[PDB]
Amino acid sequence: MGHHHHHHSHMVKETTYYDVLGVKPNATQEELKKAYRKLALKYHPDKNPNEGEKFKQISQAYEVLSDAKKRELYDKG
């Protein structure tokens, strides 16, 4: 139990960039920042190197999500 891993699901097949950040498809640029902040608190790589592997995904998706332009272009193709 615990609130560190509320989901705790071991099922993972094709995770979306929105899913990785735990954010909505209509999430705002602000919400995108907040998603990363929330995840950072939970899976902080400097605190849990074991979850840093997951955080690799977070960092990448955040990289494009932190900028509406990249987010748009990426989704465009």
Side-chain angles (χ1 to χ4, degrees):
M1 297 187 296
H3 294 125
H4 303 282
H5 290 89
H6 191 102
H7 299 86
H8 196 73
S9 185
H10 54 271
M11 296 179 64
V12 48
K13 299 179 180 180
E14 182 179 20
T15 319
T16 60
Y17 307 101
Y18 307 170
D19 192 275
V20 177
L21 276 292
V23 92
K24 299 180 305 185
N26 64 330
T28 65
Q29 203 285 328
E30 184 189 273
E31 186 162 307
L32 277 22
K33 293 182 180 182
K34 289 179 178 179
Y36 172 83
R37 192 179 298 180
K38 185 177 181 178
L39 308 175
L41 293 174
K42 295 295 181 180
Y43 308 102
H44 200 88
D46 300 278
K47 201 175 181 179
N48 299 89
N50 179 273
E51 293 294 63
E53 290 173 88
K54 293 188 180 69
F55 203 82
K56 296 178 181 180
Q57 291 181 328
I58 294 171
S59 305
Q60 297 178 32
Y62 176 71
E63 186 51 70
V64 16
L65 270 51
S66 55
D67 177 69
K69 181 183 179 184
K70 296 176 65 178
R71 184 180 186 249
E72 199 278 297
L73 309 188
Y74 196 55
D75 252 273
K76 183 180 181 180

Coordinates of all heavy atoms in Angstrom, one line a residue:
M1 N 0.8 -1.2 0.0 CA 0.0 0.0 0.0 C 0.9 1.2 0.0 O 2.1 1.1 -0.2 CB -0.9 0.0 1.2 CG -1.9 -1.1 1.3 SD -3.2 -0.9 2.6 CE -2.1 -1.1 4.0
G2 N 0.3 2.4 0.2 CA 1.0 3.6 0.2 C 0.6 4.6 -0.9 O -0.1 4.2 -1.8
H3 N 0.9 5.8 -0.7 CA 0.5 6.8 -1.7 C 1.7 7.2 -2.6 O 1.6 8.1 -3.5 CB 0.0 8.1 -1.0 CG -1.3 7.8 -0.3 ND1 -1.4 8.1 1.1 CD2 -2.5 7.3 -0.7 CE1 -2.7 7.8 1.4 NE2 -3.3 7.3 0.4
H4 N 2.8 6.4 -2.5 CA 4.0 6.6 -3.4 C 3.7 6.0 -4.7 O 3.9 6.6 -5.8 CB 5.2 6.0 -2.8 CG 5.6 6.5 -1.4 ND1 6.2 7.7 -1.2 CD2 5.3 5.9 -0.2 CE1 6.3 7.9 0.1 NE2 5.8 6.8 0.7
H5 N 3.1 4.9 -4.7 CA 2.6 4.2 -5.9 C 1.2 3.9 -5.8 O 0.8 2.7 -5.4 CB 3.4 2.9 -6.2 CG 4.8 3.1 -6.6 ND1 5.9 3.2 -5.6 CD2 5.4 3.2 -7.8 CE1 7.0 3.4 -6.3 NE2 6.8 3.3 -7.6
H6 N 0.3 4.9 -6.0 CA -1.1 4.7 -5.9 C -1.7 3.8 -6.9 O -2.5 3.0 -6.7 CB -1.8 6.1 -6.0 CG -3.2 6.2 -5.6 ND1 -3.7 6.6 -4.4 CD2 -4.3 5.8 -6.3 CE1 -5.0 6.5 -4.3 NE2 -5.4 6.0 -5.5
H7 N -1.1 3.9 -8.2 CA -1.6 3.0 -9.3 C -1.0 1.6 -9.1 O -1.8 0.7 -9.0 CB -1.1 3.6 -10.6 CG -1.6 5.0 -10.9 ND1 -1.0 6.1 -10.4 CD2 -2.7 5.4 -11.6 CE1 -1.7 7.2 -10.8 NE2 -2.7 6.7 -11.5
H8 N 0.3 1.5 -8.9 CA 1.0 0.2 -8.6 C 0.7 -0.8 -9.7 O 1.1 -2.0 -9.6 CB 0.5 -0.3 -7.2 CG 1.4 -1.4 -6.7 ND1 2.7 -1.2 -6.2 CD2 1.2 -2.7 -6.6 CE1 3.2 -2.3 -5.8 NE2 2.3 -3.3 -6.0
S9 N 0.1 -0.4 -10.8 CA -0.1 -1.4 -11.9 C 1.2 -1.8 -12.6 O 2.0 -0.9 -13.0 CB -1.1 -0.8 -12.9 OG -1.5 -1.7 -13.9
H10 N 1.3 -3.1 -12.8 CA 2.5 -3.6 -13.5 C 2.2 -3.7 -15.0 O 3.0 -4.2 -15.8 CB 2.9 -5.0 -12.9 CG 1.8 -6.0 -12.9 ND1 0.9 -6.1 -11.8 CD2 1.4 -6.9 -13.8 CE1 0.1 -7.1 -12.1 NE2 0.3 -7.6 -13.2
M11 N 1.0 -3.4 -15.4 CA 0.6 -3.4 -16.8 C 1.0 -2.2 -17.5 O 0.6 -1.1 -17.2 CB -0.9 -3.6 -16.9 CG -1.4 -4.9 -16.3 SD -3.2 -5.1 -16.4 CE -3.4 -5.2 -18.2
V12 N 1.8 -2.4 -18.6 CA 2.3 -1.3 -19.4 C 2.5 -1.7 -20.8 O 3.5 -2.4 -21.1 CB 3.6 -0.7 -18.8 CG1 4.6 -1.8 -18.4 CG2 4.2 0.4 -19.7
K13 N 1.6 -1.3 -21.7 CA 1.7 -1.6 -23.1 C 1.3 -0.3 -23.9 O 0.2 0.0 -24.0 CB 0.8 -2.7 -23.4 CG 1.2 -4.0 -22.7 CD 0.2 -5.1 -23.0 CE 0.6 -6.4 -22.3 NZ -0.4 -7.5 -22.6
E14 N 2.3 0.3 -24.5 CA 2.2 1.5 -25.3 C 1.7 2.6 -24.4 O 0.5 2.9 -24.3 CB 1.3 1.3 -26.5 CG 1.1 2.6 -27.3 CD 0.2 2.5 -28.6 OE1 -0.6 1.5 -28.6 OE2 0.4 3.3 -29.5
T15 N 2.6 3.2 -23.7 CA 2.3 4.3 -22.9 C 2.4 5.6 -23.6 O 3.3 5.8 -24.4 CB 3.3 4.4 -21.7 OG1 3.6 3.0 -21.3 CG2 2.8 5.2 -20.6
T16 N 1.4 6.5 -23.5 CA 1.4 7.7 -24.2 C 2.2 8.7 -23.4 O 2.5 8.6 -22.2 CB 0.0 8.3 -24.5 OG1 -0.7 8.5 -23.2 CG2 -0.8 7.3 -25.3
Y17 N 2.6 9.8 -24.1 CA 3.4 10.8 -23.5 C 2.5 11.5 -22.5 O 3.0 12.0 -21.5 CB 3.9 11.8 -24.6 CG 4.6 11.1 -25.7 CD1 3.9 10.8 -26.9 CD2 5.9 10.7 -25.6 CE1 4.6 10.1 -27.9 CE2 6.5 10.0 -26.6 CZ 5.9 9.7 -27.8 OH 6.5 9.0 -28.8
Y18 N 1.2 11.5 -22.7 CA 0.3 12.1 -21.8 C 0.2 11.2 -20.6 O 0.1 11.6 -19.4 CB -1.0 12.3 -22.5 CG -1.0 13.0 -23.8 CD1 -2.1 13.1 -24.7 CD2 0.2 13.7 -24.3 CE1 -2.1 13.8 -25.9 CE2 0.2 14.4 -25.5 CZ -1.0 14.4 -26.3 OH -0.9 15.1 -27.5
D19 N 0.2 9.8 -20.9 CA 0.1 8.8 -19.8 C 1.3 8.8 -18.9 O 1.2 8.7 -17.7 CB -0.1 7.4 -20.5 CG -0.5 6.3 -19.5 OD1 0.4 5.7 -18.9 OD2 -1.7 6.1 -19.3
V20 N 2.5 9.0 -19.6 CA 3.8 9.0 -18.9 C 3.8 10.1 -17.9 O 4.3 10.0 -16.7 CB 5.0 9.2 -19.9 CG1 6.3 9.3 -19.2 CG2 5.0 8.0 -20.8
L21 N 3.3 11.3 -18.3 CA 3.2 12.5 -17.4 C 2.0 12.4 -16.5 O 1.9 13.2 -15.6 CB 3.2 13.8 -18.2 CG 4.6 14.3 -18.7 CD1 5.4 14.8 -17.5 CD2 5.4 13.3 -19.5
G22 N 1.2 11.4 -16.7 CA 0.0 11.3 -16.0 C -1.0 12.5 -16.1 O -1.6 12.9 -15.2
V23 N -1.0 13.0 -17.3 CA -1.7 14.2 -17.6 C -2.8 13.9 -18.6 O -2.8 12.9 -19.3 CB -0.8 15.4 -18.1 CG1 -0.7 15.4 -19.6 CG2 -1.2 16.7 -17.6
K24 N -3.7 14.9 -18.8 CA -4.9 14.7 -19.7 C -4.5 15.2 -21.1 O -3.5 15.9 -21.3 CB -6.0 15.5 -19.2 CG -6.6 15.2 -17.8 CD -7.8 16.1 -17.4 CE -7.4 17.5 -17.5 NZ -8.5 18.4 -17.0
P25 N -5.2 14.7 -22.1 CA -5.0 15.1 -23.5 C -5.2 16.6 -23.8 O -4.7 17.1 -24.7 CB -6.0 14.2 -24.3 CG -6.4 13.1 -23.3 CD -6.3 13.7 -22.0
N26 N -6.0 17.2 -22.9 CA -6.4 18.6 -23.0 C -5.7 19.4 -21.9 O -6.1 20.5 -21.6 CB -7.9 18.7 -22.9 CG -8.5 18.3 -21.5 OD1 -7.9 17.4 -20.9 ND2 -9.6 18.9 -21.1
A27 N -4.7 18.8 -21.3 CA -3.9 19.5 -20.3 C -3.2 20.7 -20.8 O -2.8 20.8 -21.9 CB -2.9 18.5 -19.7
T28 N -3.2 21.7 -19.9 CA -2.6 22.9 -20.3 C -1.1 22.9 -20.2 O -0.5 22.0 -19.6 CB -3.1 24.0 -19.4 OG1 -2.7 23.8 -18.0 CG2 -4.6 24.0 -19.4
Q29 N -0.5 23.9 -20.7 CA 1.0 24.0 -20.6 C 1.3 24.1 -19.1 O 2.4 23.5 -18.7 CB 1.4 25.3 -21.3 CG 2.9 25.3 -21.7 CD 3.8 25.6 -20.6 OE1 3.5 26.3 -19.6 NE2 5.0 25.0 -20.7
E30 N 0.4 24.7 -18.3 CA 0.6 24.8 -16.9 C 0.5 23.4 -16.3 O 1.2 23.0 -15.4 CB -0.5 25.7 -16.3 CG -0.3 25.9 -14.8 CD -1.5 26.6 -14.2 OE1 -1.5 27.9 -14.2 OE2 -2.4 25.9 -13.7
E31 N -0.5 22.7 -16.7 CA -0.8 21.3 -16.2 C 0.3 20.4 -16.6 O 0.6 19.5 -15.8 CB -2.2 20.9 -16.8 CG -2.6 19.5 -16.2 CD -4.1 19.2 -16.4 OE1 -4.9 20.1 -16.0 OE2 -4.4 18.1 -16.9
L32 N 0.9 20.6 -17.7 CA 2.1 19.8 -18.2 C 3.2 20.0 -17.2 O 3.9 19.0 -16.8 CB 2.5 20.2 -19.6 CG 1.7 19.6 -20.7 CD1 0.4 19.1 -20.3 CD2 1.6 20.5 -21.9
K33 N 3.5 21.2 -16.8 CA 4.5 21.5 -15.8 C 4.2 20.9 -14.4 O 5.1 20.3 -13.8 CB 4.6 23.0 -15.5 CG 5.2 23.8 -16.7 CD 5.3 25.3 -16.4 CE 5.8 26.1 -17.5 NZ 6.0 27.5 -17.2
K34 N 3.0 21.0 -14.0 CA 2.5 20.5 -12.8 C 2.6 18.9 -12.7 O 2.9 18.4 -11.7 CB 1.1 21.0 -12.4 CG 1.1 22.4 -12.0 CD -0.3 22.9 -11.7 CE -0.3 24.4 -11.3 NZ -1.7 24.9 -11.0
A35 N 2.3 18.3 -13.9 CA 2.4 16.8 -14.0 C 3.8 16.4 -13.7 O 4.1 15.5 -12.8 CB 2.0 16.4 -15.4
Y36 N 4.8 17.1 -14.3 CA 6.2 16.8 -14.1 C 6.6 17.0 -12.7 O 7.3 16.2 -12.1 CB 7.1 17.6 -15.0 CG 8.6 17.5 -14.7 CD1 9.4 16.5 -15.3 CD2 9.2 18.5 -14.0 CE1 10.7 16.4 -15.0 CE2 10.6 18.4 -13.7 CZ 11.3 17.4 -14.2 OH 12.7 17.3 -14.0
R37 N 6.1 18.1 -12.1 CA 6.4 18.4 -10.7 C 5.9 17.3 -9.8 O 6.6 16.9 -8.8 CB 5.8 19.8 -10.3 CG 6.3 20.3 -9.0 CD 5.7 21.7 -8.7 NE 6.1 22.7 -9.7 CZ 5.7 24.0 -9.6 NH1 4.9 24.4 -8.6 NH2 6.0 24.8 -10.6
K38 N 4.7 16.9 -10.0 CA 4.1 15.8 -9.2 C 4.9 14.5 -9.3 O 5.1 13.9 -8.3 CB 2.6 15.6 -9.6 CG 1.8 14.6 -8.8 CD 0.4 14.5 -9.2 CE -0.4 13.5 -8.3 NZ -1.8 13.4 -8.7
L39 N 5.2 14.1 -10.5 CA 6.0 12.9 -10.7 C 7.4 13.0 -10.1 O 7.9 12.1 -9.6 CB 6.2 12.7 -12.2 CG 4.9 12.8 -13.0 CD1 5.1 12.7 -14.5 CD2 3.9 11.7 -12.6
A40 N 7.9 14.2 -10.2 CA 9.3 14.4 -9.6 C 9.3 14.2 -8.1 O 10.2 13.6 -7.6 CB 9.7 15.8 -10.0
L41 N 8.2 14.6 -7.5 CA 8.1 14.4 -6.1 C 8.0 12.9 -5.7 O 8.5 12.4 -4.7 CB 6.9 15.1 -5.6 CG 7.0 16.7 -5.6 CD1 5.6 17.3 -5.2 CD2 8.1 17.2 -4.7
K42 N 7.3 12.2 -6.6 CA 7.0 10.8 -6.4 C 8.2 9.9 -6.8 O 8.7 9.1 -5.9 CB 5.8 10.3 -7.2 CG 4.5 11.0 -6.9 CD 4.1 10.5 -5.5 CE 2.7 11.2 -5.1 NZ 2.3 10.8 -3.8
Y43 N 8.7 10.1 -8.0 CA 9.8 9.2 -8.5 C 11.1 9.9 -8.7 O 11.8 9.6 -9.6 CB 9.3 8.6 -9.9 CG 7.9 8.0 -9.9 CD1 6.8 8.6 -10.4 CD2 7.8 6.7 -9.3 CE1 5.6 8.0 -10.3 CE2 6.5 6.1 -9.3 CZ 5.4 6.8 -9.8 OH 4.2 6.2 -9.8
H44 N 11.4 10.9 -7.8 CA 12.6 11.6 -7.9 C 13.8 10.7 -8.1 O 14.2 9.9 -7.2 CB 12.8 12.4 -6.6 CG 13.7 13.6 -6.7 ND1 13.4 14.8 -7.1 CD2 15.1 13.7 -6.4 CE1 14.4 15.6 -7.1 NE2 15.5 14.9 -6.7
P45 N 14.5 10.8 -9.2 CA 15.7 9.9 -9.6 C 16.8 10.0 -8.6 O 17.5 9.0 -8.3 CB 16.1 10.4 -11.0 CG 15.5 11.8 -11.1 CD 14.2 11.8 -10.3
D46 N 17.0 11.2 -8.0 CA 18.1 11.4 -7.0 C 17.7 10.7 -5.7 O 18.6 10.6 -4.8 CB 18.4 12.9 -6.8 CG 18.8 13.6 -8.1 OD1 20.0 13.5 -8.4 OD2 17.9 14.3 -8.7
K47 N 16.4 10.4 -5.5 CA 16.0 9.7 -4.3 C 15.7 8.2 -4.6 O 16.0 7.4 -3.7 CB 14.7 10.4 -3.8 CG 14.5 10.2 -2.3 CD 13.3 11.0 -1.8 CE 13.1 10.7 -0.3 NZ 11.9 11.5 0.2
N48 N 15.2 7.9 -5.7 CA 15.0 6.5 -6.1 C 15.5 6.3 -7.5 O 14.8 6.5 -8.5 CB 13.5 6.2 -6.1 CG 12.9 6.3 -4.7 OD1 12.4 7.4 -4.3 ND2 12.9 5.3 -4.0
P49 N 16.8 5.9 -7.6 CA 17.4 5.6 -8.9 C 16.8 4.4 -9.6 O 16.9 4.3 -10.8 CB 18.8 5.2 -8.4 CG 18.8 4.9 -7.0 CD 17.7 5.7 -6.5
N50 N 16.1 3.6 -8.8 CA 15.3 2.4 -9.4 C 14.2 2.9 -10.3 O 13.9 2.3 -11.3 CB 14.8 1.5 -8.3 CG 14.0 0.3 -8.8 OD1 12.8 0.4 -9.1 ND2 14.7 -0.8 -9.0
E51 N 13.6 4.0 -9.9 CA 12.4 4.5 -10.7 C 12.9 5.6 -11.8 O 12.1 6.1 -12.6 CB 11.4 5.2 -9.8 CG 10.7 4.2 -8.9 CD 9.8 3.2 -9.7 OE1 10.4 2.4 -10.5 OE2 8.6 3.1 -9.5
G52 N 14.2 5.8 -11.8 CA 14.8 6.7 -12.8 C 14.6 6.2 -14.2 O 14.6 7.0 -15.1
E53 N 14.5 4.9 -14.3 CA 14.3 4.3 -15.6 C 13.0 4.8 -16.2 O 12.9 5.0 -17.4 CB 14.4 2.8 -15.5 CG 15.8 2.2 -15.2 CD 15.8 0.8 -14.9 OE1 15.9 0.0 -15.8 OE2 15.7 0.4 -13.7
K54 N 12.0 4.8 -15.4 CA 10.7 5.3 -15.7 C 10.8 6.8 -16.0 O 10.1 7.3 -17.0 CB 9.7 5.0 -14.6 CG 9.4 3.5 -14.4 CD 8.3 3.4 -13.4 CE 7.9 1.9 -13.1 NZ 9.0 1.2 -12.4
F55 N 11.5 7.5 -15.2 CA 11.7 8.9 -15.3 C 12.3 9.4 -16.6 O 12.2 10.5 -17.0 CB 12.5 9.5 -14.1 CG 12.3 10.9 -13.8 CD1 11.2 11.3 -13.0 CD2 13.2 11.9 -14.2 CE1 11.0 12.6 -12.7 CE2 12.9 13.2 -14.0 CZ 11.9 13.6 -13.2
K56 N 13.0 8.4 -17.3 CA 13.6 8.7 -18.6 C 12.5 9.1 -19.5 O 12.6 10.0 -20.3 CB 14.4 7.5 -19.1 CG 15.6 7.1 -18.2 CD 16.3 5.9 -18.7 CE 17.4 5.5 -17.8 NZ 18.1 4.2 -18.4
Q57 N 11.4 8.3 -19.5 CA 10.2 8.6 -20.3 C 9.6 9.9 -19.9 O 9.3 10.7 -20.8 CB 9.2 7.5 -20.0 CG 9.6 6.2 -20.5 CD 8.5 5.1 -20.2 OE1 7.8 5.2 -19.2 NE2 8.4 4.2 -21.1
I58 N 9.6 10.2 -18.6 CA 9.0 11.5 -18.2 C 9.8 12.7 -18.7 O 9.2 13.6 -19.2 CB 9.0 11.5 -16.6 CG1 8.0 10.5 -16.1 CG2 8.5 12.9 -16.1 CD1 8.1 10.3 -14.6
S59 N 11.1 12.6 -18.6 CA 11.9 13.6 -19.0 C 11.8 13.9 -20.5 O 11.7 15.1 -20.9 CB 13.4 13.3 -18.8 OG 13.6 13.0 -17.4
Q60 N 11.7 12.9 -21.4 CA 11.5 13.1 -22.8 C 10.2 13.7 -23.2 O 10.1 14.6 -23.9 CB 11.7 11.7 -23.4 CG 13.1 11.1 -23.3 CD 13.2 9.7 -23.9 OE1 12.5 9.4 -24.9 NE2 14.0 8.9 -23.3
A61 N 9.1 13.1 -22.7 CA 7.8 13.6 -23.0 C 7.6 15.0 -22.5 O 7.1 15.8 -23.1 CB 6.7 12.6 -22.4
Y62 N 8.2 15.2 -21.3 CA 8.2 16.6 -20.7 C 8.9 17.5 -21.6 O 8.6 18.7 -21.7 CB 8.8 16.6 -19.3 CG 8.9 18.0 -18.7 CD1 7.7 18.7 -18.3 CD2 10.1 18.6 -18.5 CE1 7.8 20.0 -17.7 CE2 10.2 19.9 -18.0 CZ 9.1 20.5 -17.6 OH 9.2 21.8 -17.0
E63 N 10.0 17.1 -22.2 CA 10.8 17.9 -23.1 C 10.0 18.5 -24.2 O 10.2 19.7 -24.5 CB 12.0 17.1 -23.6 CG 13.0 17.9 -24.4 CD 13.5 19.1 -23.7 OE1 14.2 18.9 -22.7 OE2 13.1 20.2 -24.1
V64 N 9.2 17.7 -24.8 CA 8.3 18.2 -25.8 C 7.0 18.9 -25.2 O 6.5 19.9 -25.7 CB 7.9 17.1 -26.8 CG1 8.3 15.7 -26.3 CG2 6.4 17.1 -27.2
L65 N 6.5 18.3 -24.1 CA 5.3 18.8 -23.4 C 5.5 20.2 -22.8 O 4.6 21.0 -22.7 CB 4.7 17.8 -22.4 CG 3.7 16.8 -22.9 CD1 4.1 16.1 -24.2 CD2 3.3 15.7 -21.9
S66 N 6.7 20.5 -22.4 CA 7.1 21.8 -21.8 C 7.0 22.9 -22.8 O 7.0 24.1 -22.5 CB 8.5 21.7 -21.2 OG 9.4 21.3 -22.1
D67 N 6.9 22.5 -24.1 CA 6.9 23.5 -25.1 C 5.8 23.1 -26.1 O 5.8 22.1 -26.8 CB 8.2 23.6 -25.9 CG 8.1 24.5 -27.0 OD1 8.0 25.8 -26.8 OD2 8.2 24.1 -28.2
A68 N 4.7 24.0 -26.1 CA 3.5 23.7 -27.0 C 3.9 23.5 -28.4 O 3.2 22.8 -29.1 CB 2.6 24.9 -26.8
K69 N 5.0 24.2 -28.9 CA 5.4 24.0 -30.3 C 5.8 22.6 -30.6 O 5.3 22.0 -31.5 CB 6.6 25.0 -30.6 CG 7.0 24.9 -32.0 CD 8.2 25.8 -32.3 CE 8.7 25.7 -33.7 NZ 9.9 26.5 -34.0
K70 N 6.7 22.1 -29.7 CA 7.2 20.7 -29.9 C 6.1 19.7 -29.8 O 6.0 18.8 -30.6 CB 8.3 20.4 -28.9 CG 9.6 21.3 -29.1 CD 10.6 21.0 -28.0 CE 11.1 19.6 -28.1 NZ 12.1 19.3 -27.1
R71 N 5.2 20.0 -28.8 CA 4.1 19.1 -28.6 C 3.2 19.0 -29.8 O 2.7 17.9 -30.2 CB 3.3 19.6 -27.4 CG 2.1 18.8 -27.0 CD 1.4 19.4 -25.8 NE 0.3 18.5 -25.2 CZ -1.0 18.7 -25.3 NH1 -1.4 19.8 -26.0 NH2 -1.9 17.9 -24.8
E72 N 3.0 20.2 -30.5 CA 2.1 20.3 -31.6 C 2.8 19.6 -32.8 O 2.2 18.8 -33.5 CB 1.8 21.7 -31.9 CG 0.6 22.0 -32.7 CD 0.9 21.8 -34.2 OE1 1.7 22.6 -34.8 OE2 0.3 21.0 -34.9
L73 N 4.1 19.9 -33.0 CA 4.8 19.4 -34.1 C 4.9 17.9 -34.0 O 4.8 17.2 -35.0 CB 6.2 20.0 -34.2 CG 6.2 21.6 -34.2 CD1 7.6 22.1 -34.5 CD2 5.2 22.2 -35.1
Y74 N 5.2 17.4 -32.8 CA 5.4 16.0 -32.6 C 4.1 15.2 -32.9 O 4.2 14.2 -33.6 CB 5.8 15.8 -31.2 CG 6.4 14.4 -30.9 CD1 7.5 14.0 -31.6 CD2 5.9 13.6 -29.9 CE1 8.0 12.7 -31.4 CE2 6.4 12.3 -29.7 CZ 7.5 11.9 -30.5 OH 8.1 10.7 -30.2
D75 N 3.0 15.7 -32.4 CA 1.7 15.1 -32.7 C 1.3 15.3 -34.2 O 0.6 14.5 -34.7 CB 0.6 15.7 -31.8 CG 0.1 14.8 -30.7 OD1 -0.8 14.0 -31.0 OD2 0.7 14.8 -29.6
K76 N 1.8 16.3 -34.8 CA 1.6 16.5 -36.3 C 2.3 15.4 -37.1 O 1.7 14.9 -38.0 CB 2.1 17.9 -36.7 CG 1.8 18.2 -38.2 CD 2.3 19.6 -38.6 CE 2.0 19.9 -40.1 NZ 2.5 21.2 -40.4
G77 N 3.5 15.1 -36.7 CA 4.3 14.1 -37.4 C 5.6 14.6 -37.9 O 5.7 15.1 -39.0

